Ligand binder design. Structure first.
Ligand SMILES: *[C@@H]1O[C@H](CO)[C@@H](O[C@@H]2O[C@H](CO)[C@@H](O[C@@H]3O[C@H](CO[C@H]4O[C@H](CO[C@H]5O[C@H](CO)[C@@H](O)[C@H](O)[C@@H]5O)[C@@H](O)[C@H](O[C@H]5O[C@H](CO)[C@@H](O)[C@H](O)[C@@H]5O)[C@@H]4O)[C@@H](O)[C@H](O[C@H]4O[C@H](CO)[C@@H](O)[C@H](O)[C@@H]4O[C@H]4O[C@H](CO)[C@@H](O)[C@H](O)[C@@H]4O[C@H]4O[C@H](CO)[C@@H](O)[C@H](O)[C@@H]4O)[C@@H]3O)[C@H](O)[C@H]2NC(C)=O)[C@H](O)[C@H]1NC(C)=O
Ligand SMILES: *[C@@H]1O[C@H](CO)[C@@H](O[C@@H]2O[C@H](CO)[C@@H](O[C@@H]3O[C@H](CO[C@H]4O[C@H](CO[C@H]5O[C@H](CO)[C@@H](O)[C@H](O)[C@@H]5O)[C@@H](O)[C@H](O[C@H]5O[C@H](CO)[C@@H](O)[C@H](O)[C@@H]5O)[C@@H]4O)[C@@H](O)[C@H](O[C@H]4O[C@H](CO)[C@@H](O)[C@H](O)[C@@H]4O[C@H]4O[C@H](CO)[C@@H](O)[C@H](O)[C@@H]4O[C@H]4O[C@H](CO)[C@@H](O)[C@H](O)[C@@H]4O)[C@@H]3O)[C@H](O)[C@H]2NC(C)=O)[C@H](O)[C@H]1NC(C)=O
Ligand SMILES: *[C@@H]1O[C@H](CO)[C@@H](O[C@@H]2O[C@H](CO)[C@@H](O[C@@H]3O[C@H](CO[C@H]4O[C@H](CO[C@H]5O[C@H](CO)[C@@H](O)[C@H](O)[C@@H]5O)[C@@H](O)[C@H](O[C@H]5O[C@H](CO)[C@@H](O)[C@H](O)[C@@H]5O)[C@@H]4O)[C@@H](O)[C@H](O[C@H]4O[C@H](CO)[C@@H](O)[C@H](O)[C@@H]4O[C@H]4O[C@H](CO)[C@@H](O)[C@H](O)[C@@H]4O[C@H]4O[C@H](CO)[C@@H](O)[C@H](O)[C@@H]4O)[C@@H]3O)[C@H](O)[C@H]2NC(C)=O)[C@H](O)[C@H]1NC(C)=O
Ligand SMILES: *[C@@H]1O[C@H](CO)[C@@H](O[C@@H]2O[C@H](CO)[C@@H](O[C@@H]3O[C@H](CO[C@H]4O[C@H](CO[C@H]5O[C@H](CO)[C@@H](O)[C@H](O)[C@@H]5O)[C@@H](O)[C@H](O[C@H]5O[C@H](CO)[C@@H](O)[C@H](O)[C@@H]5O)[C@@H]4O)[C@@H](O)[C@H](O[C@H]4O[C@H](CO)[C@@H](O)[C@H](O)[C@@H]4O[C@H]4O[C@H](CO)[C@@H](O)[C@H](O)[C@@H]4O[C@H]4O[C@H](CO)[C@@H](O)[C@H](O)[C@@H]4O)[C@@H]3O)[C@H](O)[C@H]2NC(C)=O)[C@H](O)[C@H]1NC(C)=O
Ligand SMILES: CCC(CC)O[C@@H]1C=C(C(=O)O)C[C@H](N)[C@H]1NC(C)=O
Ligand SMILES: CCC(CC)O[C@@H]1C=C(C(=O)O)C[C@H](N)[C@H]1NC(C)=O
Ligand SMILES: CCC(CC)O[C@@H]1C=C(C(=O)O)C[C@H](N)[C@H]1NC(C)=O
Ligand SMILES: [Ca+2]
Ligand SMILES: [Ca+2]
Ligand SMILES: [Ca+2]
Ligand SMILES: [Ca+2]
Lengths: 388, 388, 388, 388
């Protein structure tokens, strides 16, 4: 086995096709399905799997009561076979904690889980299913990381962490790991003013992360990482097509180097693929809440502060609940290009549906096609009333 | 690993022996068994498995209500170990959608799932568990495919698709795939006037598909495919032993090149083995509904419009519900001939049993023997009243 | 991989140690455990597993009602990991039917399942998980076989079948298989007057089967098979220590060549290890019913019509239900001798416990030790009242 | 594969990080989780797993009633994937019995289970999943062993057994196994006056076991084993930081060669890492009951009868139930040192929580870090009232 290198460009994205869907909430109405949130997808050279943070209880279990709570001792990063639901009997625990990332380097997988109280959290870095390195909180305020997969190049896997306020300046660091060991870390540089929950992907040009500014911005900050030099830059998506949630309406001039104003102290994890004319942005349809999901083709969105959509695709109707979204790719697929993929977390229960006492989600996932495929919509599909 | 070639003829069929049975509805009365329909069987070089379209809920789950519905976003092609039932915990998702086919080429498996609304459906072709190619609807009217396994020769795997009306002329295409990539496609030629849900098998003479004419015919159309030249012909089974359902009574002269009349806009997926004097046809016992199942030895059924049975075997009593049936073979078995096999879908619930609000099925499967074996009958075996 | 040869003698048996126990009925009170009966144990070169005939329902499932019934279409031979219970989610179906045997030859496993109505039953012989050969009923009266493992030598695996009356002379055949193919079969010869449900083991001297005479005898018939010459002899255990159930009290002179009288048209599957001074017999403690189980060291029991016990070990107290028992050995274990093993089926439910409507069992299993180990007793352990 | 040799020293322990946690009781409120107690953790060269003694019933099962009982015929040593809970469907049975140990030698795993009545118990030694050797009770009074992993060096795996009184002098033996075979055994020598439930680990200096004196001592006895010479010594931890439970308050002078007095006929399994200035002791926080858990850095605790803590870490709050604790290490990890690990059994139910009729546990586990990591606390997390 050799370390994977990012030698390909993105495939041309002309539409999106269904990749995976687990229908976890539907099935968990009458099966031993774990309560989760913060899901993602990540590939090994021989298999792609769903990932999420378990809450250490099933949905029908009485301990599902109170699972809106983010950071208990009963959480763990689990993985399970593609499009199966996360069950007690098929879920593999990768590490223990309430914030995570994970990625395969071509030889083995690195998984990182953070646990602890708000003022004393720590990250444990696992490699090849063994703990290798640990990182203590540096700002004593909820050390946290991506909640989707990291990306590796020739054994080097960069990860973005934040420690500090969610409603003001915080201390963001980019760590560079190899075989679980810390090669280097850097403080955040560039014009991004607040960074959380980065969604990353890699291609020949380097590693691109689309993150969330929770403090002031409804445009998304972007971190661009060179995994060879182990250096990075940051800014915002220049486009006036704003992609955080909640957010103001789309203006005609975006902001490249500062938060676009209107909504403070809020946001959702999201993603984009930034690739010149081949650029596609994901966002919730609603500007007010986590409902609906759509992809928009916005040429040069990263660098053009006037850029508007020229094509799109609805993924989830506005009538249906969405949630977190993030990027991943099968870096070990055949062919001459990397096929862009993403998942959308479909949150059910609290706070929006409070007849039940739990919060969970299911997953839908798409990858790009060079065809111009017809579109459908992909709801969670569970009837909340069945759980009453 | 090498691509499989179809180098053998069919084994002489003198009777049928039990191959597999999952008793899924019996077991699912008190286990986490997924609601399914449209099942089949398909072999890898090292394992044979059951396949079906899940409905994304268990039978005892409240979401089983309404599963007579064919095309929801909650369906997926799943596979599971031979004769086990399709459970939440043992089912492997092959792809997402509501119409499918799947086959192994000797090196890896190709699976195809179609999803979307009626006017905007698309097929995604997976190879070696990765998406490779996509096909958009060409007639904007429920793009659909075999619902049983495809067959490969030297890496080339033909698949029959239909897009268009189920009650009039439609647009049928034969696609030729290799490693998931589209080599070629052709429009339907020959005398078959309507094609749906082809059941296929391969042998030295080529690939033979027995399909369903949903429009006018109660005889079954046949497509014969040369996977080397990538060409095909079509006609109907000439025999007056009619094998669709519902159907008229058997006449003494069948039809080779046109639908045999009596029943319009209806039918069921079925199969046959067409091999000269070694020819066997499957059919429901009832001419009116999907009940019972029998095999009939009808010499030269394909080409002889006077041909009648000279031997038979009851598989399911007329008193018991049947459903879809299709062909498969273990192409990787030892010996000098390919042993013909088939499955029968045993549908339970709606529309025939409407005290329950669900529709599901179990599977029974047989393969041929050169012995003249005693016959039994093989009902689903569940008591519907237990579910009330 | 090479075919296994029987090159070793039996280890000296000085006591019996616990080998496996699944507690299936206890666990199945609140888990998806399949209803079974007729269990056994059999080893592969890399794993040993529990086997049994499923009834195609769980114990808590409503379809458990009526499972005293022996021969439904819903039965299958399943295998599952040693000492785990037979669950819906961990059980592997070997073949479909209501009477079975199975054994590994060193390269692959042969499994045989019989199905059909009483007058038209057939055996299907599977090898390396594929059907290879089939055998039609020859007496049209419940074709049936061992219900425990067969034994192989240099690829040749003999199996004992019976077709015909259970209450009079029947037609017993010994079949000799290699890679699932029929090499040869012989009609029963020797002085055994009725043969059912043979329990077999192999060692350098050949293959020894201890069976059940259901017609007239309460001593057990024995078949001795030479797997090289493919020939056999038969007689009864000469010892007056009678080992069938029900049975008369032990006399002081046994019978070598005829049924010992007292109980007609009844019996239970059992076993023995016949090895000169190293001879041990298994039996129920009760002479009237299937309760208790004990092993008795009876020197030269096979050939000495005066032989009595000189040592023993209680396995199951008379107060607890037992049932079928049979032999197996790990032929792939390290060392210079084959360690004798056996299982006892612990039947719960009907007919003896009729407050419940089901019949099932759990398994306990022992192997021999060269130590003189202390003895315990090994009940099923379920409380029947919990199921009411 | 080669036998593992203990060639490394312990990593410097500056804090403890979360390693694993299964949340078994939470999940088992609504899943098929087996009732357990006496858990531990042990690594293979390619995987680390949780181990425990099942009670042969699930928690929600009616047979959970009475599981405070220690030694039934329904117990077995099971193992299951790291941080998953012990379920009916994912648990692998290693052997049958009510007291156990297990360890991998680099080539294969040895597991030992003891079963029987109090006066006639026996150990069966399994190697590479086969029974190899057996040991009969020598004192006829509950033959028993470690309840956590053993340790191997160049194929030699020492195990500590005790047979005899729990409230007076007993007969302790150290056995030395290789490939499951008994190389040698010795009677206990040294100044330890009573030995139970040893927790062991290995490093270049040899094998160190921290045990429980159930008779008179609230300091812990220590056995130090040379696996090459196959010899041992024993004493107590000299430190006045007392680590049994229940126990007196900490004095200023401990005892090196005799039980520290105050509490008779009681105790709990525990552990320590004894490594000069790198020494850490585990203990319950409460002196009266099995509640809370803490690690204390006590330099030269083994040899210094005045030694006090200079650093510590809370693992479980005093408000939460703890239980057994023991040592293990991943001997096959990369790097230049062995990373010290431990687990704590979190007992729920009887006797402390008698509203329920069962006794079970969950597991939390930590390994050492060279960082000074922030601390959290790790409760079982189940709400007992949910089970009423
Ligand atoms: C079968 O499936 C297929 C495949 O999916 C279906 O075909 C798809 O249909 C969908 C729906 O129509 C399309 O998505 C929309 O795409 C448009 C972009 O394409 C249009 O505009 C292009 C750009 O034109 C401009 O520039 C060009 C330069 O070339 C110039 O020529 C032109 O004059 C103009 O200046 C056109 O090029 C394009 O034409 C082409 O395509 C046509 C087919 O689409 C074809 O007919 C033409 O011949 C030509 O080939 C086309 O006109 C997106 O703009 C749109 O997204 C907006 O609207 C949706 C609602 O539908 C909304 O949710 C989006 O967020 C977005 O609108 C918001 O944001 C805007 C940007 O800021 C803003 O301006 C809006 O006011 C709006 O903002 C409000 O809402 C948001 C969200 O809540 C909020 O945040 C704001 O604050 C504010 O409140 C859709 O993505 C697919 O592209 C199309 N795919 C294909 C391959 O055709 C087909 O329909 C299915 N068949 C059936 C029968 O069902
Ligand atoms: C133990 O198990 C064994 C093995 O399973 C059992 O043995 C089996 O028994 C079954 C049941 O009898 C047999 O199945 C039937 O087979 C017959 C065909 O064989 C008969 O006819 C042959 C052809 O004869 C003609 O041509 C020959 C040329 O050689 C000529 O010689 C002859 O005069 C005549 O012209 C004969 O060769 C054959 O004889 C041989 O076999 C005999 C044993 O079977 C033996 O005794 C002889 O010595 C000789 O060796 C034999 O006579 C099928 O015709 C039949 O299928 C029809 O009937 C069933 C109902 O049973 C029906 O469901 C079928 O659909 C079909 O009938 C419908 O279709 C016909 C064709 O259009 C039509 O003509 C009918 O009117 C009818 O149509 C109506 O119903 C359908 C369906 O609902 C509907 O669609 C229509 O519209 C309409 O309403 C059976 O398949 C097995 O072959 C046999 N197997 C073996 C190896 O023997 C055994 O019984 C078991 N033992 C016990 C104790 O239980
Ligand atoms: C800790 O665990 C250990 C290890 O398990 C326990 O030790 C074990 O204890 C058990 C129970 O006692 C023993 O099992 C019994 O073994 C005897 C056989 O051994 C006795 O007899 C031997 C033969 O003696 C004869 O020949 C010799 C020739 O050498 C001659 O010297 C002698 O005079 C006589 O002629 C003796 O050699 C042997 O002595 C040796 O062992 C002694 C210890 O056992 C020791 O003290 C001596 O010093 C010496 O070393 C010993 O005396 C079996 O006969 C017996 O089985 C019968 O009884 C049980 C009931 O207990 C019954 O279920 C059996 O079926 C059987 O009895 C039925 O069948 C008979 C044969 O037909 C018949 O004669 C009976 O009337 C009876 O028939 C009735 O019931 C049956 C069944 O329902 C029915 O079918 C009939 O129709 C009828 O109704 C036991 O198997 C173990 O051998 C022993 N193991 C060891 C290693 O010691 C220990 O107890 C445990 N410790 C504690 C504290 O619990
Ligand atoms: C974020 O997380 C971090 C990392 O976890 C947190 O930092 C940790 O904080 C905890 C809690 O405070 C610390 O654990 C305690 O450690 C002390 C030992 O360290 C103290 O003492 C050291 C020794 O000093 C002595 O010798 C030195 C020689 O150098 C000499 O200089 C000195 O004068 C004195 O003679 C000091 O070196 C050490 O100072 C260092 O560290 C300080 C930070 O801790 C720092 O500020 C200093 O600058 C310096 O660097 C420090 O003073 C343990 O003693 C203590 O354990 C005792 O207390 C707990 C209760 O808290 C109890 O449960 C323990 O069992 C134990 O006390 C019992 O046993 C004693 C021994 O017999 C006995 O004397 C006691 O009376 C008591 O006995 C009673 O209870 C027991 C149990 O029920 C019963 O059995 C008895 O019978 C009786 O009833 C703690 O383990 C960590 O070390 C510390 N870690 C780090 C890296 O700093 C941080 O707090 C978190 N942040 C936030 C905001 O939450
Ligand atoms: C703690 C900062 C951050 C922003 C408020 O919280 C998050 C928001 C989330 C959300 O907006 O859905 C859920 C997260 N799991 C969470 N992260 C952690 C570590 O708790
Ligand atoms: C849509 C045409 C066709 C004929 C009416 O429908 C089918 C009939 C079926 C049936 O007759 O049982 C069930 C099928 N799953 C279905 N195919 C799809 C794609 O919905
Ligand atoms: C039998 C002596 C010993 C000390 C009283 O008992 C133990 C105490 C235990 C306890 O204190 O929790 C539980 C154990 N599983 C047990 N060991 C056996 C073999 O029963
Ligand atoms: Ca924001
Ligand atoms: Ca038709
Ligand atoms: Ca008898
Ligand atoms: Ca003590």
């Amino acid at each position: 086995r050799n370390f994977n290198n990012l030698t390909k460009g993105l495939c041309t994205i002309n539409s999106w096709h269904i990749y995976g869907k687990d229908n976890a909430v539907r099935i968990g109405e009458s099966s031993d399905v774990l309560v989760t949130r913060e899901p993602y997808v990540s590939c090994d050279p021989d298999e792609c799997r769903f990932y999420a943070l378990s809450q250490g209880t099933t949905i029908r279990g009485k301990h599902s009561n109170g699972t809106i709570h983010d950071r208990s001792q009963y959480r763990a990063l689990i993985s399970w076979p593609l499009s199966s639901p996360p069950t007690v009997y098929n879920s593999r625990v990768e590490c223990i904690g309430w914030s995570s990332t994970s990625c395969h380097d071509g030889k083995s997988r690195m998984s990182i889980c953070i646990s602890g109280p708000n003022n004393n959290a720590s990250a444990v870095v696992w490699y090849n299913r063994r703990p290798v390195a640990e990182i203590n909180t540096w700002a004593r305020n909820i050390l946290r990381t991506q909640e989707s997969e990291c990306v590796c190049h020739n054994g080097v896997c960069p990860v973005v962490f934040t420690d500090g306020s969610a409603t003001g300046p915080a201390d963001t660091r980019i760590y560079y790991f190899k075989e679980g060991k810390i090669l280097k870390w850097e403080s955040l540089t560039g014009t991004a003013k607040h960074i959380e929950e980065c969604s990353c992907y890699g291609e020949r040009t380097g590693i691109t992360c689309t993150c969330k500014d929770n403090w002031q911005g409804s445009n998304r900050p972007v971190i661009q990482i060179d995994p060879v030099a182990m250096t990075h830059t940051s800014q915002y998506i220049c486009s006036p097509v704003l992609t955080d949630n909640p957010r103001p309406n789309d203006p005609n001039i975006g902001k490249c180097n500062d938060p676009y104003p209107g909504n403070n102290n809020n946001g959702v994890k999201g993603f984009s693929y930034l690739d010149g004319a081949n650029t596609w942005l994901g966002r919730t349809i609603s500007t007010a809440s986590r409902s609906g999901y759509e992809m928009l083709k916005v040429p040069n969105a990263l660098t053009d502060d006037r850029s508007k959509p020229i094509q799109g695709q609805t993924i989830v109707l506005n009538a249906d609940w969405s949630g977190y979204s993030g990027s991943f790719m099968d870096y070990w697929a055949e062919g001459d290009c990397y096929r862009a993929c993403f998942y959308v977390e479909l949150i059910r229960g609290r706070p929006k549906e409070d007849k039940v006492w739990w919060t969970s989600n299911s997953i839908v996932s798409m990858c790009s096609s060079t065809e111009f495929l017809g579109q459908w919509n992909w709801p969670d599909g569970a009837k909340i009333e069945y759980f009453l």
